[PDB]
Amino acid sequence: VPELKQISRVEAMRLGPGWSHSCHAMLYAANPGQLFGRIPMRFSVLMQMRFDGLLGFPGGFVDRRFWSLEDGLNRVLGLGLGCLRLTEADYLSSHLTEGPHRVVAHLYARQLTLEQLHAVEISAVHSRDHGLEVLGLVRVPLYTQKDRVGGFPNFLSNAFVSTAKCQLLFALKVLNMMPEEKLVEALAAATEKQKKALEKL
Amino acid sequence: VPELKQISRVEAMRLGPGWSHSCHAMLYAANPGQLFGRIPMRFSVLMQMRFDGLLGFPGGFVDRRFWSLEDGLNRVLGLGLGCLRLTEADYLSSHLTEGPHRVVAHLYARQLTLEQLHAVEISAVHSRDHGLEVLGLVRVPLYTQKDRVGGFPNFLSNAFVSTAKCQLLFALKVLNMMPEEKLVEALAAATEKQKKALEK
Amino acid sequence: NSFVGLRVVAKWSSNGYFYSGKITRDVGAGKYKLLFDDGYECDVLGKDILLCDPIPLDTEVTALSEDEYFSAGVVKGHRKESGELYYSIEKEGQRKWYKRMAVILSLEQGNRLREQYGLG
């Protein structure tokens, strides 16, 4: 599992002006549904297709000269999701992203109801950033099918913002949504799929 | 370049019972908008994240002993896109998929206004299969950014239904949405990305 | 034998980029407290530290051009003004001036300096 270097919040707030700060939110909810009436979904997590053709979480870069990290996140969420407000109680972690640029990525996470999660999807299609910076929301499939690739392994084989993919797996583990043994398994199947597909071409 | 064997519509309907048929729809719209106020978006195309974690077009398999290609496709579209029915005039192509299994994939395509396309996106969020077989709709970025990967090349590096990726590239060409050299360049950068990313 | 106060180019991760900074404390056991010019402060092992200031001429580096994108270049000159160091980086036959913090090394570019300037 790829891991970024963690930094405490107070120490991230001491980083100099040469650092850019990004805030993104992982919204998820318990899902009692069953795909095909036989595959429990367990949880749904929201990600999005970005303008640059990569998957990531809602959010973006924030200005924290005169605003908190939560106020900046809510600004980029109001444009990207049009949803309600997150608070400091939703803050999960901060990471130093892979270079070359100096960026510290803050991750927030809140468990909603499935109804509230769908309401975020409805608001997102009506948001200002829909069609411009955000090209659509996608739910993360956490199930795996009998073929051992369908679902979560296939999903991890897409193209991500490297920070977001690390944040997704880090959150699924520490929020007790997926056993770490299952994440390494799915990530291994995804890489294997990427190997074969690339060996052919 | 992904290029499946193309067969005529009549040649596909006379294939034996061992062949499966699938029908998918490519809904697109001319887009006069500019990203960041500089790069043009040109066209917007609708695809979807499937239950199996792959990108593809709306549609699915059609059993010809129960449905015609059109009635079968529209039953699936009704469950994911709301009120949108295509006809035989929206038919574009038929392609024979890679083995082992023998499947013939029928591509349908209809141009919409950007307003109508956004209305389809709104209906999809409220559809019956939203959160079951369809996990969300996405717009294809047909532009390339200054770094030569941002946009369409990055998009082509995602994981697709093998048939869907060929149908997208085929449809962008024959519908005069992307030049040939414009597709080759994007697909070559996408492949270089998948190599550069898997080695690191 | 004290490294405190010396300018270095170091990486704060085992596989990351090398950034300019200074050594602040000798944490011991081959470990050093390093304050990077960007304000980041953390413990770094000697093997991750390059004791070289400025980056030598003809070294291949990764520079921030136009304040948006990084790309590879070759050092061709140094100049200090009002205490700030400027690097002359040549990219594809064109030279420009870059601030110190706009000049970094990739993992491969820095690892190639470990035997000449490394601290471990």
From Swiss-Prot, chain A:
GO terms in the biological process aspect are: negative regulation of double-strand break repair via nonhomologous end joining
Q: Where is this cross-link: Glycyl lysine isopeptide (Lys-Gly) (interchain with G-Cter in ubiquitin)?
A: K5, K146
**Compartments where located:** Nucleus
Which residues make up the annotated site Required for interaction with TP53BP1?
K5
- Give a GO cellular-component term: nucleus
Q: Where is this region: Interaction with PXN?
A: 113-200
Where is this chain primarily localised? nucleus
- What molecular function does GO assign, one term? snoRNA binding
What are the entry keywords? Isopeptide bond, Nucleus, RNA-binding, Ubl conjugation
Q: How does it assemble?
A: Homodimer. Interacts with TP53BP1 (via the Tudor-like domain); interaction is abolished following DNA damage and TP53BP1 phosphorylation by ATM. Interacts (via the cytoplasmic part) with SDC4. Interacts with TGFB1I1 and PXN.
Task: Family membership, please give it.
Answer: Belongs to the Nudix hydrolase family. TIRR subfamily.
What this chain does, per the entry, is described as: Key regulator of TP53BP1 required to stabilize TP53BP1 and regulate its recruitment to chromatin. In absence of DNA damage, interacts with the tandem Tudor-like domain of TP53BP1, masking the region that binds histone H4 dimethylated at 'Lys-20' (H4K20me2), thereby preventing TP53BP1 recruitment to chromatin and maintaining TP53BP1 localization to the nucleus.
- Spell out the protein name for this chain: Tudor-interacting repair regulator protein
Q: Which organism is it from?
A: Homo sapiens
Give the classification, highest ranks: Eukaryota, Metazoa, Chordata, Craniata, Vertebrata
Per the record, the gene is NUDT16L1
UniProtKB/Swiss-Prot annotation, chain C:
Residues covered by region (Tudor-like): 1-120
> What does the record give as the function of this protein?
Double-strand break (DSB) repair protein involved in response to DNA damage, telomere dynamics and class-switch recombination (CSR) during antibody genesis. Plays a key role in the repair of double-strand DNA breaks (DSBs) in response to DNA damage by promoting non-homologous end joining (NHEJ)-mediated repair of DSBs and specifically counteracting the function of the homologous recombination (HR) repair protein BRCA1. In response to DSBs, phosphorylation by ATM promotes interaction with RIF1 and dissociation from NUDT16L1/TIRR, leading to recruitment to DSBs sites.
Pathological condition linked to this protein in its record: A chromosomal aberration involving TP53BP1 is found in a form of myeloproliferative disorder chronic with eosinophilia. Translocation t(5;15)(q33;q22) with PDGFRB creating a TP53BP1-PDGFRB fusion protein.
Note the position of the cross-link Glycyl lysine isopeptide (Lys-Gly) (interchain with G-Cter in SUMO2): K80
Result of mutating D38R?
A: Abolishes recruitment to double strand breaks and induces defects in class-switch recombination (CSR)
Q: Where is this region: Interaction with dimethylated histone H4?
A: 12-40
Q: What PTMs does it carry? A: Asymmetrically dimethylated on Arg residues by PRMT1. Methylation is required for DNA binding.
Q: Which source organism does the UniProt entry give?
A: Homo sapiens (Human)
- Under what name is this protein listed? TP53-binding protein 1
Location within or outside the cell: Nucleus; Chromosome; Chromosome, Centromere, Kinetochore
